[PDB]
Write a protein that binds this ligand. Structure first.
Ligand SMILES: O=S(=O)(O)c1cccc2cccc(Nc3ccccc3)c12
Length: 120
């Protein structure tokens, strides 16, 4: 497990809906809910679908940055935890780092999530 209950509360319903449009396993559901490394391509695609639903992805398939991140951070985590809120900097930087670089949508999300995980 690598996620808070807040993350699961926000993402769970979306990931569930995504199971209907992505050919992912029940283990993949757990991987994604737990914010674990997305080893399987199915898990990468499952999160990609849910992050689109949560408002993190632009119409053009880019990960949002700056102000456009804030509604997502609020939905996932609220604003009461200093460490989590400050992590928005790493999320913004990682989004800038990966955007444009991965034509495959699931690859974009694998690399995004890895970058965020590697960030202190
Ligand atoms: O979760 S954190 O890295 O704490 C995070 C912290 C603060 C704001 C965030 C905004 C969007 C996505 C995140 N993360 C995320 C990470 C992996 C998969 C899906 C979303 C944000």
């Amino acid at each position: 497990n690598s996620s808070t209950q807040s993350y699961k509360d926000a993402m769970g319903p979306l990931v569930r809906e995504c199971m209907g449009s992505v050919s992912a396993t029940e283990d993949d559901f757990k991987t994604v809910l737990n914010r674990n490394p997305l080893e399987s391509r199915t898990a990468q695609c499952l999160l990609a679908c849910a992050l689109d639903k949560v408002g993190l992805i632009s119409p053009e398939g880019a990960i949002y940055t700056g102000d456009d991140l804030m509604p997502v951070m609020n939905r996932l985590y609220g604003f009461n935890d200093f460490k989590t809120v400050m992590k928005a900097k790493a999320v913004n930087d990682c989004a800038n780092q990966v955007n444009g670089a991965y034509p495959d949508r699931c690859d974009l999300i694998k690399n995004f999530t890895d970058c965020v995980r590697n960030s202190y």
